Amino acid sequence: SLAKLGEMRTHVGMVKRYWNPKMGFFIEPERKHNNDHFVLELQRQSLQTAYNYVKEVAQNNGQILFVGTKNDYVKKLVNNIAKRVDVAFITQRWLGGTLTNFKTLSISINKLNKLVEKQAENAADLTKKENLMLSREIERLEKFFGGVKSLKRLPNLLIVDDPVYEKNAVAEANILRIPVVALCNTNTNPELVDFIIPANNHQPQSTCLLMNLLADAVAEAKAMPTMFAYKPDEEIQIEIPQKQEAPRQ
């Protein structure tokens, strides 16, 4: 009915001996691999809880948020999710103060929109150098605020691929009372993140799998067809460069 265990050929395993001990409740006693394998049943109920909460939030008529910062593949991935579902996101660095304070960023996004409409209405009546420089800060503002622009208040919920790399983001979310869901690797700290999904974020194929199922789990509540969610088979398998070598130097 939903994401059988057959897909899990390599989505468990992380750098050895680099695991927070308090989260071992999700991990069975170690094998010789030393790459921390998981329990897929608890994985399934975690995804089920995440799905029935994100669907509820989407039908609750709220705004959710997406976070991605790792080098290329997660950034292009969240870009694909955004171009596939009309919803805000972040691609560049988390601004360190994005959510705990919003007036000083709401004014900036409003200035972004004002300059966007200024270009949209001006028929190059300004000087050529003036048009050039105006487009220059337009490019900068699209680069930094491209994702978070279709919102008025702070998001009712947000996701994150790796709370460890987004310690700033998850910390700012925890400061406020808004919940958070994460793709918690073996080095995360479970008590911080509200809803835990023990998935391997080192392998790009696992990342695309998980965020695509999440995207369809929210798009089905958005009335869009769930391409990867509730799909039986022969759709989950996504192209991937050779995905192995879980340990890292």
Binding site: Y53, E56, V57, N60, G62, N156, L157, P179, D194
Partner: peptide, 5 residues
């Protein structure tokens, strides 16, 4: 948190 609202 039980539910959203």
């Amino acid at each position: 948190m039980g539910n959203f609202d």
